[PDB]
Amino acid sequence: MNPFHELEPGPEVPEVVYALIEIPKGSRNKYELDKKTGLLKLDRVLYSPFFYPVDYGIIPQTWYDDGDPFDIMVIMREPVYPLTIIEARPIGIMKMEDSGDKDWKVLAVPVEDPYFNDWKDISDVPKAFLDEIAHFFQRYKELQGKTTKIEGWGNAEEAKREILRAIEMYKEKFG
Amino acid sequence: MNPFHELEPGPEVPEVVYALIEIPKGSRNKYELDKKTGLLKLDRVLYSPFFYPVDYGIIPQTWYDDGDPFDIMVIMREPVYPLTIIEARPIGIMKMEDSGDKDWKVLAVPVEDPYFNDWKDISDVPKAFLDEIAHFFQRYKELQGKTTKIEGWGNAEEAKREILRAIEMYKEKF
Amino acid sequence: NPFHELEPGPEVPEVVYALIEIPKGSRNKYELDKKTGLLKLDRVLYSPFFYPVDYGIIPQTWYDDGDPFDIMVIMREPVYPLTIIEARPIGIMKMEDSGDKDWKVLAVPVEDPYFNDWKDISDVPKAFLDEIAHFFQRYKELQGKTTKIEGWGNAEEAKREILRAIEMYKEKFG
């Protein structure tokens, strides 16, 4: 099966979405779903000694301007394993470009973790913890000669707007 | 595929059973299987700083009184990855109720680790180990307001009977 | 089943798929349950050794010892089981296991610039080739088995056996 194709975007879109984690926090290896089989594939080894500061994944049955599934970042105190589904609550969206491609990424918190019960919008996140995620994606492909532009952070109301548009975009392409 | 439905209960029931692990030892994220897809899911982060004292999973093609597959606990020296199949030897069963539901759990050891070759019945497990587990499940939902009762441990003869009953509960429901 | 349906590689024999079954640093020995494709615990290595490499199989291959072709990938950070790697062969290990031709490819990840200049067996520090062979020489000693390390062949010979392993499979199943 291809969990990107088979799974639904979420049980209560857009307040709660399904996050399919490809990369646990602390990983220097970059993974992604093999578009053919849906198995975990090593994309590359980060050219620098950086690690994903967040549990990285995608929202199933979503498509975005950058020709990929919609990227999502989930804050987990304990990193999960690849190909795990999390019920998460979007709280914001990171606005960045990559080689002219709009590579925006939803930021989200888990619903079933009471530690984040009061995290509902971007302002609830420590400012330092936003700067760190921005600096990761600003620099994690420098030694690959790639230039990245961090444009800003949107609030929870915009993050949900983009998912509804990524959900449609998928229906348009594969529907 | 949903592994819970496609795998036989074991190669030699009830002496040896398959343990499909969902939660490695040392984990605090509580995982389960998605009935629709068979993928690993995040059930909940344990509200307390406790970690599963054992490799925790289910026995495929089983059904129990509490409306769920039969839980099995396997004592691994090194944790396995989720969704890994273990050929284990049952040695006992923990009799606990959870919110009024009969939620007994088989305790087992791996066949393929000679460390546990001499482990065969519940008496063979250090008392201090049987206490830590019973305390884990007694309390790992306390902050959630849920009440769990630890009745005690049954021996290997008992745990093996329950397996056969849980098997007969699966063929009956599906 | 990933072994049966994945291709052998995006550019064989120069770039092959490595389907990892055992991440580096693991004392457990995991193999693919060939009937479902799920990970399965073969056996806990009787001795305190850990796999020195990311160990797996090449899909749609079949070798003289009656199993998918073994391949070893030198990863700095070990991956998770069932992870695909596009690797480059730089050598091969020649060893007899119980009288069966049990050769294993040695390769590096294509997308790790650290190993950019690793193109043949000779670019590997000798002491590393000495640690792998010793692992396999003794990792089944307490089990009563006998493994015989013959030597190391170069890349030209590993790519051949890869092609000769892609055919046997077509002959065995195609």
Going by the DSSP 8-state scheme, the letter that residue C11 receives in this structure is B
**Long-range CB contact pairs, C64-67, < 8 A, 24+:** C64/C100, C64/C101, C64/C168, C65/C97, C65/C100, C65/C101, C65/C102, C66/C100
A70, A166 Cβ separation under 8 angstroms: yes
One-letter amino acid of C96: E
> Inter-chain contact B1–C26, Cβ cutoff 8 Å?
no
B48 closest CA partner among B113, B140, B136, B116: B140
Strands (E), chain C: 16-22, 28-32, 39-44, 54-57, 70-73, 84-97, 100-101, 104-109, 147-153
Choose among B27, B39, B45: nearest Cβ to A3: B39
Residues contacting B93, CB < 8 A, separation 6+: B104, B105, B106, B107, B153, B154, B158, B159, B162
Strands (E), chain B: 17-23, 29-33, 40-45, 55-58, 71-74, 85-98, 101-102, 105-110, 148-154
Q: How distant, in Å, are the alpha carbons of B135, C6, C38, C108, C173 from that of C1?
A: 40, 8, 8, 24, 14
* CA–CA min distance B81, chain C (Å): 8
> Inter-chain contact C44–B110, Cβ cutoff 8 Å?
yes
Measured in degrees and rounded to the nearest 5, phi and psi for residue A135 equal -70, -30
C161, C7 Cβ separation under 8 angstroms: no
Distance CA C160, CA A136 (A): 42
Does A45 touch chain C if contact means CB atoms closer than 8 Å? yes
In chain A, whose CA is at the least distance from the CA of C5? A37
The count of other CB atoms within 10 Å of the CB of residue A97 is 16
Contact list, C39 vs chain B (CB under 8 Å) = 81, 83-85
> Which tokens is A49 given?
């000694």
**Residue matched to tokens 């984990």:** B27
- Taken in order B33, B34, B35, B37, the sign of the CA dihedral is negative
Does C67 touch chain A if contact means CB atoms closer than 8 Å? no
Backbone φ/ψ region at C37: left (φ over 0), alpha (ψ -120 to 50), beta: left
B154 closest CA partner among B110, B98, B100, B90: B90
> Which tokens is C134 given?
């010793």
**Residue matched to tokens 């790790």:** C112
| Model resolution, angstroms | 2.3
CB-neighbour burial class of residue B74 (10 A; exposed 0-12, middle 13-18, buried 19+): buried
Q: Spell out the domain ranges in chain C.
A: 1-174
Distance CA A69, CA C30 (A): 32
**Residue matched to tokens 């950019």:** C116
> Inter-chain contact B87–C39, Cβ cutoff 8 Å?
no
Distance CA A150, CA A94 (A): 8
Class of domain A1-175 (CATH, top level)? alpha beta
Choose among B28, B40, B44: nearest Cβ to A112: B44
Does A118 touch chain B if contact means CB atoms closer than 8 Å? no
Q: How distant, in Å, are the alpha carbons of B112, B162, C67, C78, C150 from that of B165?
A: 26, 5, 38, 42, 53
Distance CA B137, CA C23 (A): 31
Q: How distant, in Å, are the alpha carbons of B24, B26, C48 from that of B77?
A: 11, 11, 12
> Inter-chain contact C41–B87, Cβ cutoff 8 Å?
yes
Residues contacting C148, CB < 8 A, separation 6+: C95, C96
How would you classify the pairing of strands A101-102 and A84-98?
Answer: antiparallel
Distance CA A161, CA A167 (A): 10
Does A169 touch chain B if contact means CB atoms closer than 8 Å? no
At C83 the three-state DSSP class reads coil
B91, B38 Cβ separation under 8 angstroms: no
B66 is in an annotated binding site: yes
CB-neighbour burial class of residue B13 (10 A; exposed 0-12, middle 13-18, buried 19+): middle
Q: Which residues of A are annotated as a binding site for Mn(2+)?
A: 66, 71, 103
**Long-range CB contact pairs, B154-159, < 8 A, 24+:** B154/B92, B154/B93, B154/B95, B154/B122, B155/B92, B155/B121, B155/B122, B155/B123, B156/B90, B156/B91, B156/B92, B156/B120, B156/B121, B156/B122, B158/B92, B158/B93, B159/B90, B159/B91, B159/B92, B159/B93, B159/B106, B159/B107
Backbone discontinuities in chain A, residue before each (C to N > 2.5 A): none
Expt. technique: neutron
Question: What subunits touch chain C, counting only 3 or more CB pairs under 8 A?
Answer: A, B
B20 closest CA partner among B104, B92, B84: B84
Distance CA B130, CA B119 (A): 14
Q: ∠ CA(B26), CA(B29), CA(B31), 5° rounding?
A: 105
> Inter-chain contact B37–A1, Cβ cutoff 8 Å?
yes
Does B169 touch chain C if contact means CB atoms closer than 8 Å? no
CATH 3.30.830.10 fits B1-174, yes or no: no
How would you classify the pairing of strands B71-74 and B105-110?
Answer: parallel
> Which tokens is B5 given?
């439905």
**3-state secondary structure string, A111-126?**
CCCHHHCCCCCHHHCC
The count of other CB atoms within 10 Å of the CB of residue B143 is 11
Question: A-C interface: how many C-beta pairs under 8 angstroms?
Answer: 47
The count of other CB atoms within 10 Å of the CB of residue A59 is 30
